[PDB]
Amino acid sequence: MKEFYISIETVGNNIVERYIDENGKERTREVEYLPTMFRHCKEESKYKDIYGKNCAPQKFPSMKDARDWMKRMEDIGLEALGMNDFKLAYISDTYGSEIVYDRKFVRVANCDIEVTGDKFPDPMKAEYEIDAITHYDSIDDRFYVFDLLNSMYGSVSKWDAKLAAKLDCEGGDEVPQEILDRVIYMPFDNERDMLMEYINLWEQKRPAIFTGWNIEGFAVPYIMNRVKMILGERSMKRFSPIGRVKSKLIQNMYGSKEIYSIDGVSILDYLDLYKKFAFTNLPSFSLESVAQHETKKGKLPYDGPINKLRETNHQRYISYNIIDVESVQAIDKIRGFIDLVLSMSYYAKMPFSGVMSPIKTWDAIIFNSLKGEHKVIPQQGSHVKQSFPGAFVFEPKPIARRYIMSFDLTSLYPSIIRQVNISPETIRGQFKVHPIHEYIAGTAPKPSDEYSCSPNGWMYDKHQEGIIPKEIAKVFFQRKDWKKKMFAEEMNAEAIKKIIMKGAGSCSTKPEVERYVKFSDDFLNELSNYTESVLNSLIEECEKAATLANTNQLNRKILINSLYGALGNIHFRYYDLRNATAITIFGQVGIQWIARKINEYLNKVCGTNDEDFIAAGDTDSVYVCVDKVIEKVGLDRFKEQNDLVEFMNQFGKKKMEPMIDVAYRELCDYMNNREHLMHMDREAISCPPLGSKGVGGFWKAKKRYALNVYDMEDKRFAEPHLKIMGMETQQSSTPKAVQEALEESIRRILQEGEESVQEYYKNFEKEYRQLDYKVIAEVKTANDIAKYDDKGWPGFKCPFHIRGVLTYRRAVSGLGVAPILDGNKVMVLPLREGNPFGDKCIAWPSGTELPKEIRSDVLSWIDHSTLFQKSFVKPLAGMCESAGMDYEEKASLDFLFG
Template sequence: MSDFYINVVQHGNQLLVREFDKGKRVNRRVTFEPTLYVHSRKNSKWKTLEGRSVEPVRFKSIRDAKDFLNMHQNTPELVHGLNSYQYVYIGDRYPDFINWDMEKLLLITLDIEVESENGFPDAQKAEEKLLCITVKNHSNKAIIVWGIGPYVNDKVRYIECENELDLIKKFIQFWHKTQPDVITGWNVQFFDIPYLCNRITRLLGEKELKKLSPWGIVKEDTVKQTQFGKAQQKYNLLGVSVLDYLDLYRKFTYVNRESYRLDYIAEVELGEKKDPNPYETFREWYTKDYKSFVDYNIQDVELVDKLEDRMKLIELCMTLAYEAKVNLIDVYSPIRVWDVLIYNFLKDKHIVIPSKRVSKKDEKYEGAYVKEPQTGLHNWVMSFDLNSLYPHLIMQYNISPETVAAEGNGDVSVDKMLKQVVDIPQDGYAVTPNGARFRTDAQGFLPNMMETMYNDRVKFKKWSLEAKQKFEDTQDKRYLNDISKYNNIQMARKIALNSAYGAIGNQYFRYYDRRIATAVTTSGQLAIRWIENKVNGYLNKLLDTTDVDYIIASDTDSIYVRFDELVSKLNPKNPVDFLDKVAKEKIEPYITKCYEELAEYVNAYEQKMEMAREVIADKGIWTAKKRYILNVHDS
């Protein structure tokens, strides 16, 4: 029987814990006794990142630990340890792999409909009456609707209410008794939940509002929602995780859509559309045809539920959270995820983390390299991609907070390193194009983590593919769970790896160091420009040309190479097969050789650049940076 946490929050002097204990769901208030660490002259099993001994200082309460930290606020370097104690609790209580079960969690999809007597309703003012509330249980697919007016539908449980006040009271009664773990919906974070909270407060007062939280604690907050460019109100129902499906879709699909209306996304992803409004106005609809209006409300929760069945973004979010041992809502923050990942990784090695300090970000620094493309039409294009560039750069140069040298390498730049005019001494330090130097006598914790996570990702991806093959061979449905589980784990590792630089380059990250942040970006520029130059040289020699630029475009970790001249010269019967063979037998081995030369030049800890052919296209059109279209034959 597997136990796992549902939600752990720090509130005042206590931790509010929701978890499964011996298979039973429990809510408990924990009086937590924190431990921090201070420098010690005695040899100790606990060390700092620099290898200095520290000894534990135990406190009777969170308040005592907070007072101790306040005493040392001017000398934070003397105190070590994580003071977000909910994550300390999770890490201590669940030290091993967490075998969580989505079926045990109560995931509710929520959607409300309100009157629109005065245009689109304002969630913060909540002046319009609630017309109906619909929820759907993701596990058993049961739908409950609270409405005002007659409605019959055998597929849902409909609760007819006398008026709006009766509707709200009955909904609160259900919610308080049921205590959901996770709420989702489409824009539920910034409309449905704040509207409900504000309307409940307006009509029944804050006492009733508090029943939406299993702890009786509801906090109002204001956040800047960048896509709309304005501050928006949100509510934190302590103990309940809100995973807005709109936010998940934006974060984890890596595509730009022309619209993010649920109707549009459902059509793109599911091939389904919501029923159109049969009347001129929304008001006419709910006043003249209440039944079809409620059907419309039900469609919203059905579509979000179907999106999850198809895309499994909530399942992916949960996988990432339980891998990192954070709360579900923390997956939106790479800083939080990586802070806790590093804490647990180092704790297992008896290394304590430094106190968190907000660093000053002096000025904006250069990011990835994007070449000005050769605009227009190009024939026979192949692209070559570097594999997980930033994580592998961290591994290659051994980039880590405890490996960076105090002294830099003087006047260094990407251009100078491309020309190999920088004198790099063989003194046990790798050098990056920003002039930073990193020890190579021992692997740093950050590249160690990257390597472990990357290798695990490869392993789980392989297991997922093997399970898929076994299912196809046997049609045994037992393998379906393995396919989903292993694929989610490998995707969670991929997301964590790809988000690492988002944390490293943020001034609010515990380990932020401008030298480290720019070491990653400038070494990335060097890697892609190095290979651009080398491949150009190779093709000029092969085709007996001089200074012809065969690289149409390059962007961060990819180059797009024109092979039209080679195809025209040799006129192969099947150009796609021919180019595939050229890539495998000639270009890729040459690229590997060139990256080995780069690794040797910069004194790399190890050569980690892996570049492989991605697509073969017979035509490609570029109009500007990052604006192109390819007619792909093989990828």
């Protein structure tokens, strides 16, 4: 517990600093910072450039003096060495040592809003009245829902939690009780006092980080722009503690979003946090989808516009917003993302918003590590954005890979940069570089004997460790240190759990249990008789230590993995194109070289010649088909599938792994690089079930496979674990039953035999018509109907939806239903030949139900239709054909011919 910063800004020449004092109370200091910069010098000094040149410091009265000095030295073309972002400099000088923090005293705000909008408006174009107030707090852990008692768009009853805490039938709204007590409420006479008290809440309850699902794309713009259109510049500024709250807009290819920054508070979206720090790919990045992914607490699925819900059944309306915010809070509880940003920005000594762009996240850490040796960073120059070779993927043969193993590289670009010794100042000219194909085959001549090399022909020093590799190491070993701490902590937790179930005693003493170190066996033995209370407190301390270790491990991983995307970003400070095209092209040469060596060893062991054993691969991971070795040894000699997986497991370690090591040491020798750091172990083993006809995995194209994975990262699976990517099993345009059937067909075609996939096709054909018509039918957007109508008949290239809607309008003309116009999303399905409507299509507003009079025939005239050939049979054929099989048995006379 110490003093630290919550947000830093700079106005004029004074730098404001929202911070937590040593006592624990938020303060808003503001000091006259004096910039300290650096310049070229011909005189020896302790302050040196990265190249070793002598550098002279300088201290300045005010920041504006430095910003004039830069313009001075930028008119004679002399490098203005030293940090030019005073915010980073201030944090470094203000704290210097490693900063110990406490998330408990930082005020994060979770907010979601729901406007009284009949038609969904633009975030910056406000035309509908705001009614939802939500601002969950961390240091206060209390909701804020002050119900708009009466408004200009009607009056509503009071929101009472006691009646809404039960189930819908009982009068409640399926929202948990333990969160309802958090909610507050007070009435309102209009929206003016609501806005007034909201801005007040912003004043007295001033958050540190303002987050929420898509907060920067919806609530922030809408909330501020309504205040602007109504109140004006007055009160709108109060949002920022210093008043520098500045109109910021970002024109985009999608249109005009007024991406806004509230000065003095870091507006960190949560949607981008999940999009960036999770590596999880779910097709629907809407909040409820990821919630069901993580917390599984889906809402009650009732459809229709919620305008009537605002006045009538407003209790359910408010409960929707309550669970909306609780979903994001639960996502935080399960991932701890804001914990990660807090733990990372203090490590990089930079403002919180910096976590977004890694350019800063590295420009700060390499600086504050270069401060120790008194070395001084260089002025940012000016480069040009260039497209150069990047990632690499082999062309897989769309075949049925039966018994296949896989490996991956532990960290591609960090290890590349360490091994080649690539840095902005470790560059020493080029050599002659032949076409890449020659180097992969190994016949090409050794490029040099004095320096390290990369196959784009630039030669870099060896002995002098670069700044970039040294920083990568200072991150890598810290990562492994914290990981070892976490392993020791989990071992200790297991030991304590095993202690609590045998023996007991009464001893309420709680000594200073050591931290950051595994406890001695005697020390944990002497407190074995601690009953449960103090033992549970110790276990809670162990869990808290595990949480800090986890945060440290994740933030370390993200950092090391981002050095590349930084080093190729034109606006990085240490950018150099040669450096970039020497760590990507070396990646391609490394993967193709290891592929060549895999083939050269597998053709040798198996016996065949000119056989490509690599099934597929990215630049860092490869899948190699190993069916030939399994055939050589024999399938029948085994007794259980576990024997098969164990053989495939130890075959990589005993035989393949040393070959990998030697064939990458040959890379290290080829260009005489510094040292060998690449790793490669069996990331996944795919194998068909023992005895079953099952394919056991197949490819379809570049990066669309399917595998019945049985072992992932040395974790035996008691049951088959399905692993697919790029297939058509997750696209939103198909119904859930269609996707479930597709995934079951995958499970069959992989694990089960042909008869299984054959009979399942017809079973699902029978069952497929036995679902609701609306879920099966797709939806399209219809615009410009008048272009393609002639008395309801098809026009010139009349779209499916247009034809369907014209026929529907001809069907129910004058029947009183709402007309279907342009711009409305309309659900469409075809009809069989000879339907009474005279056309092979039908269309009506989505979600809505068509009139009952035409409901019968449209159901009868679409029975056993062909539409699922356009939905499910086509993808099934696309997979099965590449799987060496066909679903519907094409019987013929072939057995008579032979």
